[PDB]
Symmetry: C2
Subunit: 160 residues, 2 copies
């Protein structure tokens, strides 16, 4: 209606924009818990809906990266334990979740299979060492077949 009304409309659009600016900034640096308020007026509702969606997306996305950060430490800790021979240590999948949690069990399961082969070897070789030669090393696939043939090799030497 007047020159003052125009100036005022602009001063308001400018501060509404400044608030959205402060908000996006508070996202750029982890402040993703404190919810955004409601839109200043009809024209900014869709915009504000997206801000909320964004905050939500950034929040979850940060949790997952945090996960992968816990995964690396756990793997590193397990690696250290195993180099010292403490092979019963595993990555704690219990406090992880989603993708990270699955990778952790994957690692524990992969090693468990390798350890299981050794458990069996330490076993029959222990029986071979203390007399009895009845036990036979399990048959293994691919390249692990060498373990089974090598154990058979010393199985004859003894038995005959």
């Amino acid at each position: 209606g007047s020159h003052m009304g125009l100036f005022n409309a602009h001063a308001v659009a400018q501060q509404r924009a400044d608030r959205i600016a402060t908000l996006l900034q508070s996202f750029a640096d982890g402040q993703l818990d404190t919810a955004v308020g409601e839109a200043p007026a009809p024209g900014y509702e869709r915009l504000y809906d997206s801000l909320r969606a964004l905050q939500r997306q950034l929040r979850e996305q940060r949790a997952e990266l945090q996960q992968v950060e816990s995964l690396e430490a756990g793997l590193a800790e397990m690696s250290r334990q195993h180099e010292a021979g403490w092979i019963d240590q595993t990555i704690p999948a219990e406090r992880l979740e989603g993708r990270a949690a699955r990778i952790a069990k994957g690692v524990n399961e992969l090693v468990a299979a390798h350890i299981a082969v050794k458990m069996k070897v330490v076993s029959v070789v222990t029986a071979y060492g203390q007399g009895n030669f009845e036990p036979l090393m399990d048959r293994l696939p691919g390249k692990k077949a060498q373990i089974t043939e090598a154990i058979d090799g010393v199985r004859e030497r003894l038995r005959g």
Copy 2:
């Protein structure tokens, strides 16, 4: 200056907000390559700077999650190969990077150590099997000590 000027200021603030809205939305769904333009006017520059920062943050953050997605498949593939005894397979760290890349080498290194113990066992046990008993299983720490004592056990039986 006039009632029309006020209405016009509002129609403009409304479309500027609508553009920012479309932009945040194009972020909500992967369109993070096409750069945002320049701000419509002085009052929206800080806001637009943050949009660019956000797009950049969302872009990198997506790359890392993509990484962890490639890590899980690689681990799964290696796990499958190893269950079939193809123990020379590893997770391809070469096409990964950052955190994911380190986790991959960690896994390959952890297993390599376990495999190395078996290589040594298959070795001296092979020599024990084909006559000569001079070789001695390496001394192992923690719980892997059983392997070394078990191999010693069958080392005497033969030698005497």
